């Protein structure tokens with residue numbers, strides 16, 4: 001797979017059911033400690049759903065991060081529109097088996113702010129059926145997604161209305177072949193500089209990735225940064 | 226170790242705890258720092274309300290975990 005082929009696959013997914021964007025504060029950490037061990041316990045990584053026409057914000061507090069554009073085909077542990085908290089894989093359990101089983105099936109704190117229903121605290125959000133959630137009156141907006149193809153359905157109402165949404169949260173296990181592009185903030189010299197460092201590190205291992213600017217439901221190739 | 230309790234008034238409470246501490250103990254520490262009676266505290270971690278008498282370790286509450294306080 002070459003640079004243009006990754007870009008083409010990325011843009012096809014972006015303009016269909018969407019894909020993943022994973023900003024990182026420490027790209028050398030991500031390269032050496034997350035990406036490289038996958039070639040020869042950071043099994044699950046956080047990422048955000050991006051899609052053409054979905055005005056989705058990325059997690060970048062000071063607007064100076066690079067990151068990875070990751071294929072919609074990465075293994076999905078769970079998706080939560082408002083980032084319902086998860087626990088870390090505990091000692092004695094297999095990381096690769098931890099999600100979706102221990103992924104919260106709804107956002108407890110989110111559903112409670114929405115409805116003020118104190119019955120909500122009577123259940124364990126990781127161990128709850130659709131029928132129980134119906135009985136609790138848990139709104140659909142607070143229920144997690146486990147089938148990637150259905151994330152665009154969860155995000156349809158803001159997308160249709162053209163509204164801005166805060167960073168969404170998926171737990172994925174991404175494989176080297178899932179890495180499709182490098183994220184670049186066009187208004188941040190520090191992001192671009194980190195992006196170049198990351199592109200060089202990845203290229204040296206046989207992964208020549210395009211530079212991708214994502215903002216507000218649109219994504220473009222950057223020739224060079 | 227230190228854990229963080231977020232309230233719905235926008236506060237974040239810092240607590241010094243050992244993993245062998247009980248939820249009761251954690252609620253006592255929230256009384257000590259904020260004058261909240263324990264019987265009025267729900268402690269939420271990763272989508273479940275925590276039971277008095279079980280320990281942080283039993284719920285896998287690690288260093289720098291974030292809990293959510295909700296008043297009863």
Ligand SMILES: NC(=O)c1cccnc1
Pocket residue numbers: 021022023024046047048059083167168169170
């Ligand atoms: N690093 C990320 O992209 C991310 C996404 C959602 C939540 N936290 C982090």
